[PDB]
């Protein structure tokens, strides 16, 4: 009737709570590692950024964005989808590369024709150099990265281990390095293949950086979301428990009365 | 559709359906959120909240609770107000601009209040 | 000073002398040095602080002296004396196979790692 | 190929006495498989 | 004490003399197997000649058909246990007075033994069916209604029967009537009017679980939701030392088994490994009793983590090998353990030494 | 109102038209699988091709099923 | 005693029908009290009566009703309970200028079972009365008095007691505090200054209500 | 375990376990997803699906449903074909080739038919 339907549902809320507790704990384990990884990657990047500034690097765009293959990371997917959406108003034609299963869906609805290359995305472990290098290698052929003047990367910066701000950075192309002073305060040769190689190396290093930063925010975010869910399901377990009790009590009285009318007649 | 007119019936179908979607998702919205539910469905939920606030209509003998005098709105006028809103031609103003208002014109006029 | 870091761990520093092998031959840097941007090839890398010495084995990367004694080294996964025979035997096979099997470049890079290791 | 693909292969050879620590070993491997894409339209997926 | 031959029951929620505590559980989940093991174990004292240790068991089949009971007798006969077991039967076919009067007739037989200074043991199966018979009687004599359409005065019936089950003074010969009621639940409802009455009256419960059954663990006794109010005051000293630890290890593992697999914290994963080997150890085949000398060595192996260092699959193997290994080398230590009833520092030194040689092979 | 989830005929069928059995041959399995897949579909979990196949097929049928008052045919 | 310390016992009547006392005494307890109140009312004088708690009266009557074999309703309460609650309440009434202008105020005080208000007794008193003074356990708990939600309270044709003073300053603070309920609904709404201004007002106001027990203003 | 013989008993227990893991996993698969399962777990899901469709046998008196006559399956043949799935030697067979089969001979016959 009402009673069993309360009861079957009360077990649902109960089981959902347990699962969100479990999820938050596996997030914590992974999150430790992820952070470890992001520091070494960002650390390499900085030494590079020391070159780029001092060189005064300057100067279409490519968009890369980064998600897992798993949903329920809170609003990382759609804050990222959104901040991608803004940079389609500042380049109403830009070619979106979606690294991850989740971001891929959101953008593809908005324009199917901007979506040009997409991947299967990053797994249930921290981003890694091998992956980014190889995707970079494919990038050169399909998207013809070297003609473009800009390439651009989007991610989520894990500001705090309770917060996330979507942030971006600029991967410097092959054109830039060449015409920025590099004989003027740095010493290069015309018999160096260093610009066409330096472009590729920072395509992949910078992209590794970004990936790491987004992935860390994501794994931090799921912990936060799923914690708030444990509490939300709990508030609802307690509310269905009050109904469950009331409901059993009425059934007992209604059962009783049937006997009484019978005995009496 | 052959009694009260077809338009009326089409609107009425949509009003039950959009609202049935918002009822289905009630567990999932409270436990989780809206960026954890599908984008089409999220829209239906905002839209259904607009419909739900709209039911707020100032009344004559419930003037004390509404706090605003009575509103007589035609059936024919009513079909148009809900028809446009379902097509999201009046979702570009607050979901509280639909609270305690009579006709459609009034819905527009409260957003201009609210923005201030 | 030395900034030198790997994607698996961070291990970078005034670092007195650093000696690196590059597309420009071999380069050694002591304190301030002329600023060049040079691609590091597969390499045996030495870093010295005092007469104490540290030794790295390297897959390649990039080197850029910034003209103020700030030696930015950026390089991937390295260990040298703790990077040490069975790996040399395994690398020799890996060399063989890779020739027959971009694939031309893969086979060349593999030859450089066998050669860099045999020198140690 | 790419310079970063060249360097990437040397690194793979180097984690192969043979081995180091977990982060090295983890740092070469693909979790990502090349999904060919153009236009919307989606040509079959092959390993990156 | 009293030894049932199941390791879990004797340590976590010990059994005593004139001590009644439930065996309340779900339908055809091997209720009868929890009970049957104990009667078969009482064969051990019976064989000797100290007749103040002899529990002369009574199984009381109330509103339980002759077909079911014919297995019950057959199984007793095979293991040579119809020469002290008594089976009072008021069957499904036999009328409501006989079923109403079946627990009262059985207890009374036990009183002769108890008064002469002896012990005896009564296993009631099941008070869910005793209630049903009183209902039939009440309704035809138009007695007052109550909860669930069973009579309101059922409480008084159960209470009179369960308060005679008691451990008497030395004056009354130093004897008791030990009891173990078996209560049949409708999928695990304990909030049900007839379970609820009995639960308050009796001191302790054992609650079997449907899930454990499906999961291929039989007995499906679930020992987290088992408590005995009086419990360990009746417990072998030997078993208290090597399974105090054993409560704390299994207790943590339940709560830490609400975390499920990808991979987890270094801490959490360890707890599951330890719990699980112990759980497979406490999975036993049914109708197989155990002596005190073979329960005590195994649990010590679990506690001291010489069993929880060995694969899950190989647990079942380990158990017999270790036992045989102890009988071949030093059956002196086992006999010593048994008859002292306790572990001394000299036996505890030895007991660790022995587990080590065995783990080595 | 119509619901086909809890609509059964115990004995089994033989009373329909021969032509209608063939055309609706696997219609029963599609709709029954769809419910389960549909429930999963709402959590917002990423779904594999086997699951999205069933979800794309099922949905279209359900829209066929739907009717308006007073259409005898 | 409490009344006699604060100098006020002499203008109040107390009626007692305790729980040790027999089932008809409790039943007849409200009907008699209201007879004294009507005598004050029909001299054109103003009066008040508090029937604390009519739900325990319902119980006292239940034993009588059950032995009189009159139908049971929800919670085993009389089927004929309804007639009692209406007959009693409509005595405490405002009268016309022909009848003396006599008052006798009613504020019938109900004892919920498990704080559920879908119970047979709670609904029966709401339906007779014009408005509610719903009290919540939680607002009482976190040190606020009065502990009344105006979200659950209403007043129909009983709403009047607002003169000019209480018209100017706010023309019902309750509607605004049902504006607070919205902002704080979805805050835990807007990040806009409008919601935050109401939020900031609503929070200050909730704090300001807090009072000490048996010290009125 | 003796009345129906030890092999039979052990095989039917494995089945009871694998399905029970499948049902515990249903919850995880709903929320978490199917790729956040261990490799031991993923394989149990897979055998459990094969087993689940290995309960399906048409009958002659259910030629008012499928229209395919009944089968007779001998007790030893059930014991041996379930066992094979569970031992991992007969996970080369798909789920639909255990759908609509008799005895063992049948299961083999259906592996060929689907391939063509």
Round to whole Å and give the CA distance between E348 and A40.
52
Domain ranges, ordered by start, for chain C: 1-84, 87-119
Task: Test A71 with B36 for CB contact under 8 angstroms.
Answer: yes
In this structure, what token pair is assigned to residue E33? Answer: 């197997």
Q: For E328, how many CA atoms within 13 A lie in the half-sphere containing its CB?
A: 8
- H/E stretch holding E37 reads helix E31-41
CA-nearest residue to H28 within chain A is: A19
Which CATH number describes the domain made up of C1-84?
A: 2.60.15.10
Beta strands (DSSP E) in A57-130 are 62-66, 95-99, 115-118
Distances, alpha carbon G119 to alpha carbons A151, G89, H93, in Å: 67, 19, 61
Contact residues on chain A for C41, CB-CB shorter than 8 A? none
Hey, how many other C-beta atoms are within 10 angstroms of the C-beta on E172? Answer: 14
Q: CB–CB of D9/C106 below 8 Å?
A: yes
CA-nearest residue to C85 within chain D is: D17
Q: CB–CB of E217/E75 below 8 Å?
A: no
Q: DSSP secondary-structure letter at A73?
A: B
Q: For G164, how many CA atoms within 13 A lie in the half-sphere containing its CB?
A: 0
Round to whole Å and give the CA distance between G46 and G106.
12
Beta strand pairing status for C17-22 and E221-227?
unpaired
Is A38 buried (19+), middle (13-18) or exposed (0-12) by CB count in 10 A? buried
Catalytic: which of E66, E143, E229, E254? E229
Handedness of CA B52, B54, B58, B64 (dihedral sign): positive
Round to whole Å and give the CA distance between A104 and A120.
9
Distances, alpha carbon C22 to alpha carbons A26, A42, C25, C60, H33, in Å: 44, 24, 5, 9, 48
Distances, alpha carbon G105 to alpha carbons B22, G31, H35, in Å: 45, 15, 69
| Nearest alpha-carbon partner for E341 in E289, E292, E291 | E292
Round to whole Å and give the CA distance between B113 and B107.
10
Domain covering D1-48, topology: Atp Synthase Epsilon Chain; Chain: I; (1.10.1620)
Annotated binding-site members of E for ATP: 25-32
Residue with tokens 């227990």: H13
Select the residue of B1, B24, B36 nearest F44 (Cβ to Cβ).
Answer: B36
Superfamily of domain A26-225: ATP synthase, F1 complex, gamma subunit (3.40.1380.10)
Domain covering A1-25+226-265, topology: Helix Hairpins (1.10.287)
DSSP A200-256: HHHHHHHHHHHHHHHHHHHHHHHHHHHHHHHHHHHHHHHHHHHHHHHHHHHHHHHHH
Hey, how many other C-beta atoms are within 10 angstroms of the C-beta on C18? Answer: 24
Is G43 buried (19+), middle (13-18) or exposed (0-12) by CB count in 10 A? exposed
Class of domain E1-235: alpha beta
Q: DSSP secondary-structure letter at A15?
A: H
Domain ranges, ordered by start, for chain A: 1-25+226-265, 26-225
Q: CB–CB of E263/E207 below 8 Å?
A: no
Contact residues on chain E for H13, CB-CB shorter than 8 A? 216
Round to whole Å and give the CA distance between G95 and C20.
106
Round to whole Å and give the CA distance between E36 and E287.
7
Q: With H, G, I as helix, E, B as strand and everything else as coil, classify residue A176.
A: helix
Is H95 buried (19+), middle (13-18) or exposed (0-12) by CB count in 10 A? middle
Round to whole Å and give the CA distance between H103 and H78.
7
| Nearest alpha-carbon partner for E262 in H40, H17, A12 | H40
Round to whole Å and give the CA distance between E125 and H86.
39
Handedness of CA A87, A92, A93, A98 (dihedral sign): positive
Q: How is chain B split among helix, strand and coil, in percent rounded to 5?
A: 60, 0, 40
Contact residues on chain D for C84, CB-CB shorter than 8 A? 17
A187 Cβ partners below 8 Å, 6+ apart? C34, C35, C36
Q: For C4, how many CA atoms within 13 A lie in the half-sphere containing its CB?
A: 26
Distances, alpha carbon C60 to alpha carbons C40, C63, C80, C95, in Å: 5, 9, 14, 19
Task: Test G154 with B65 for CB contact under 8 angstroms.
Answer: yes
Distances, alpha carbon E212 to alpha carbons C2, E75, G93, in Å: 62, 24, 66
Q: For B42, how many CA atoms within 13 A lie in the half-sphere containing its CB?
A: 11
Q: Is F32 left (phi over 0), alpha (psi -120 to 50) or beta?
A: alpha
Is E76 buried (19+), middle (13-18) or exposed (0-12) by CB count in 10 A? buried
In this structure, what token pair is assigned to residue E24? Answer: 């309340």
Round to whole Å and give the CA distance between E262 and E260.
7
Task: Test B67 with G175 for CB contact under 8 angstroms.
Answer: yes
Select the residue of B30, B35, B39 nearest A232 (Cβ to Cβ).
Answer: B30
Resolution number, Å: 7.7
Contact of E215 with chain H, judged by CB distance below 8 Å, is answered with yes
Hey, how many other C-beta atoms are within 10 angstroms of the C-beta on E130? Answer: 29
Strand partners, E183: E24
DSSP C49-61: ETTEEEEEEE--E
Handedness of CA A251, A253, A256, A257 (dihedral sign): negative
Q: CB–CB of E57/E121 below 8 Å?
A: yes
Round to whole Å and give the CA distance between C84 and D14.
11
| Structure determined via | cryo-EM
CA-nearest residue to D29 within chain A is: A130
Select the residue of A69, A71, A101 nearest F44 (Cβ to Cβ).
Answer: A71
Beta strands (DSSP E) in A57-150 are 62-66, 95-99, 115-118
Hey, how many other C-beta atoms are within 10 angstroms of the C-beta on A80? Answer: 27
E278 Cβ partners below 8 Å, 6+ apart? E246, E249, E250, E253, E302, E307, E308
What is the distance in angstroms between the CA of the first residue and the CA of the last residue of chain A?
Answer: 28
Question: For residues A8, A10, A14 and A15, what is the CA-based torsion angle, rounded to 10 degrees?
Answer: 20
Contact of B36 with chain F, judged by CB distance below 8 Å, is answered with yes
Q: CB–CB of E185/E26 below 8 Å?
A: yes
Contact residues on chain A for G118, CB-CB shorter than 8 A? 246
Q: How far is CA F64 from the centre of its chain?
A: 10
Round to whole Å and give the CA distance between E128 and E187.
13
- Ordered domains of chain B (ranges, CATH): 1-116 (1.10.1140.10)
Contact residues on chain H for F14, CB-CB shorter than 8 A? 64
In this structure, what token pair is assigned to residue G16? Answer: 């007692």
E70 Cβ partners below 8 Å, 6+ apart? none
Handedness of CA A83, A88, A91, A96 (dihedral sign): positive
Contact of A101 with chain F, judged by CB distance below 8 Å, is answered with yes
Distance between D34 CA and the closest CA of chain A, angstroms: 5
Contact of D5 with chain C, judged by CB distance below 8 Å, is answered with yes
Residue with tokens 């901040």: A83
Task: Test A70 with H33 for CB contact under 8 angstroms.
Answer: yes
B44-59 in b/e form (b: 16+ CB < 10 A) is: bbebbebbebbeebbe
Chain B adjacent subunits, 3+ CB pairs under 8 A: A, F, G
Distance between H19 CA and the closest CA of chain A, angstroms: 19
Q: CB–CB of C61/A222 below 8 Å?
A: no
Residue with tokens 């060449």: A178
Strand partners, C25: C22
Q: At what angle do helices E292-303 and E315-329 cross, to 10 degrees?
A: 120
Hey, how many other C-beta atoms are within 10 angstroms of the C-beta on E157? Answer: 19
Task: Test D31 with A119 for CB contact under 8 angstroms.
Answer: no
CA-nearest residue to B29 within chain F is: F43
Contact of A110 with chain D, judged by CB distance below 8 Å, is answered with no
Distances, alpha carbon E125 to alpha carbons B109, C104, E289, in Å: 77, 82, 21
Q: DSSP secondary-structure letter at D45?
A: B
Is G26 buried (19+), middle (13-18) or exposed (0-12) by CB count in 10 A? buried
F37 Cβ partners below 8 Å, 6+ apart? F51, F54, F55, F58
Strand partners, G109: G52
Contact of A187 with chain C, judged by CB distance below 8 Å, is answered with yes
Catalytic-residue membership of G204? no
Q: CB–CB of E11/E169 below 8 Å?
A: no
Task: Test C91 with D11 for CB contact under 8 angstroms.
Answer: no
Task: Test A182 with C37 for CB contact under 8 angstroms.
Answer: yes
Q: CB–CB of A108/A115 below 8 Å?
A: yes
- G and B: touch, per 3+ CB pairs < 8 A? yes
Round to whole Å and give the CA distance between H27 and A20.
11
Which residues 3-22 of chain H have a CB within 8 Å of chain E?
A: 13, 16-17, 20
Residue with tokens 């704990």: A25
Round to whole Å and give the CA distance between G122 and G81.
12
| Nearest alpha-carbon partner for G11 in G40, G34, G38, G32 | G40
Contact residues on chain A for H38, CB-CB shorter than 8 A? none
CA-nearest residue to A21 within chain H is: H32
Which CATH number describes the domain made up of E236-361?
A: 1.20.150.20
| Nearest alpha-carbon partner for B80 in B8, B15, B6 | B8
Domain ranges, ordered by start, for chain D: 1-48
DSSP A50-66: HHHHHTT-----EEEEE
Hey, how many other C-beta atoms are within 10 angstroms of the C-beta on E278? Answer: 23
Is E90 buried (19+), middle (13-18) or exposed (0-12) by CB count in 10 A? buried
């Amino acid at each position: 009737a009402t009673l069993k339907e309360v009861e079957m549902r009360l077990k649902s809320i109960k089981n959902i709570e347990k699962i969100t507790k479990t999820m938050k704990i596996v997030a914590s384990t992974r999150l430790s590692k992820a952070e470890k990884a992001k520091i070494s990657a960002k650390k390499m990047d900085e030494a590079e950024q020391l070159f780029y500034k001092n060189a005064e690097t300057k100067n279409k765009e490519l968009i890369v964005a980064i998600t897992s293959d798993k949903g329920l990371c809170g609003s990382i997917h759609s804050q990222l989808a959104k901040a991608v959406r803004r940079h389609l108003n500042d380049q109403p034609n830009a070619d979106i590369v979606t690294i991850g299963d989740k971001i891929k869906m959101q953008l593809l609805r908005t324009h199917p024709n901007n979506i040009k290359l997409s991947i299967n995305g990053i797994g249930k472990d921290a981003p890694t150099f091998q992956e980014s290098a190889l995707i970079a290698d494919k990038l050169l052929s399909v998207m013809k990265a070297g003609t473009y003047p800009k390439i651009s990367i989007f991610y989520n910066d894990p500001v705090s281990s309770l917060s996330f701000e979507p942030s971006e950075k600029p991967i410097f192309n092959a054109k830039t390095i060449e015409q920025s002073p590099s004989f003027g305060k740095f010493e290069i040769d015309t018999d160096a293949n260093v610009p066409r190689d330096l472009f590729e190396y920072t395509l992949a290093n910078q992209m590794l950086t970004a990936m790491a930063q987004g992935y860390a925010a994501e794994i931090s975010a799921r912990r936060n979301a799923m914690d708030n869910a444990s509490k939300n399901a709990g508030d609802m377990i307690n509310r269905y428990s009050i109904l469950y009790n009331r409901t059993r009590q009425a059934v007992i009285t209604n059962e009783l009365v049937d006997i009484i009318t019978g005995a009496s007649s | 559709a052959a009694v009260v007119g077809q338009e009326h019936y089409d609107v009425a179908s949509k009003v039950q359906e959009t609202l049935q979607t918002y009822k289905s998702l009630q567990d999932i919205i409270a436990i989780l959120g809206m960026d954890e539910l599908s984008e089409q469905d999220k829209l239906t939920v905002e839209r259904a909240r607009k419909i739900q606030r709209f039911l707020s209509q100032p009344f004559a003998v419930a003037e004390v609770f509404t706090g605003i005098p009575g509103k007589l709105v035609r059936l024919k006028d009513t079909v148009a107000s809900f028809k446009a809103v379902l097509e999201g031609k009046y979702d570009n103003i607050p979901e509280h601009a639909f609270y305690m208002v009579g006709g459609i014109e009034d819905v527009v006029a409260k957003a201009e209040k609210l923005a201030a | 000073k030395l900034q030198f870091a790997l994607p698996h761990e961070t291990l970078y520093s005034e670092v007195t002398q650093v000696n690196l092998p590059a597309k420009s031959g071999r380069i050694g840097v002591l304190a301030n040095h002329v600023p060049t941007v040079e691609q590091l090839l597969p390499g045996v890398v030495e870093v010295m602080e005092g007469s104490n010495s540290k030794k790295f084995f390297i897959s390649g990367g990039f080197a850029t002296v910034q003209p103020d004694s700030q030696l930015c080294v950026t390089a991937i996964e390295a260990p040298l004396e703790s990077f040490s025979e069975n790996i040399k035997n395994l690398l020799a096979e890996a060399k063989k196979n890779v020739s027959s099997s971009r694939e031309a470049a893969e086979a060349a890079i593999q030859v450089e790692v066998l050669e860099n290791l045999q020198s140690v | 190929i790419s310079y970063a693909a060249y360097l990437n292969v040397a690194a793979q050879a180097i984690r192969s006495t043979e081995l180091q620590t977990a982060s090295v070993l983890n740092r070469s491997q693909t979790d990502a498989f090349y999904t060919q894409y153009k236009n919307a339209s989606e040509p079959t997926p092959i390993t990156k | 004490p009293v030894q049932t031959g199941l390791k879990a029951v004797d340590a976590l929620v010990p059994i005593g003399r004139g001590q009644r505590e439930l065996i309340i559980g779900d339908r055809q989940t091997g209720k009868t197997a929890v009970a049957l093991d104990t009667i078969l174990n009482q064969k051990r004292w019976n064989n000797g000649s100290d007749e103040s240790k002899k529990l002369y068991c009574v199984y009381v089949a109330v509103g339980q058909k002759r077909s079911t009971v014919a297995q019950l007798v057959q199984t007793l006969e095979q293991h040579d246990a119809m020469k002290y077991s008594i089976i009072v039967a008021a069957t499904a076919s036999e009328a409501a007075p006989l079923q109403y009067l079946a627990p009262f007739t059985a207890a009374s037989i036990g009183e002769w033994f108890r008064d002469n200074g002896k012990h005896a043991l009564i296993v009631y199966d099941d008070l869910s069916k005793q209630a049903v018979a009183y209902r039939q009687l009440s309704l035809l004599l138009r007695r007052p209604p109550g909860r669930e359409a069973y009579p309101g005065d059922v409480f008084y019936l159960h209470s009179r029967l369960l308060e005679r089950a008691a451990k008497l003074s030395e004056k009354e010969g130093s004897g008791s009537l030990t009891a173990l009621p078996v209560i049949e639940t409708q999928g695990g409802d304990v909030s049900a009017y007839i379970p609820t009455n009995v639960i308050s009256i009796t001191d302790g419960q054992i609650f079997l679980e449907a899930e454990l059954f499906y999961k291929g663990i039989r007995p499906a006794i679930n020992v987290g939701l088992s408590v005995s109010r009086v419990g360990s005051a009746a417990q072998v000293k030997a078993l208290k030392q090597v399974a105090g630890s054993l409560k704390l290890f299994l207790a943590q593992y339940r709560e830490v088994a609400a975390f499920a697999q990808s991979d987890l914290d270094a801490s959490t994963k360890q707890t599951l490994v330890r719990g699980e080997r112990l759980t497979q150890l406490l999975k036993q085949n049914q109708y197989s009793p155990l002596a005190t000398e073979e329960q005590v060595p195994l649990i010590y192996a679990g506690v001291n983590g010489h069993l929880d260092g060995i694969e899950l699959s190989r647990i079942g193997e380990f158990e017999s090998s270790f036992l045989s290994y102890l009988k071949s080398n030093h059956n002196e230590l086992l006999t010593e353990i048994r008859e002292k009833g306790e572990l001394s520092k000299e036996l505890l030194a030895s007991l660790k030494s022995a587990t080590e040689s065995f783990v080595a092979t | 109102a119509i619901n086909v989830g809890l609509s059964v005929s115990r004995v089994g069928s033989a009373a329909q038209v021969k032509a209608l059995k063939q055309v609706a041959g696997s219609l029963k399995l599609f709709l029954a699988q769809y419910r389960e897949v549909a429930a999963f579909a709402q959590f917002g979990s990423d779904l594999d091709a086997s699951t999205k196949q069933t979800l794309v097929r099922g949905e279209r049928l359900t829209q066929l099923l739907k009717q308006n008052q007073y259409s005898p045919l």
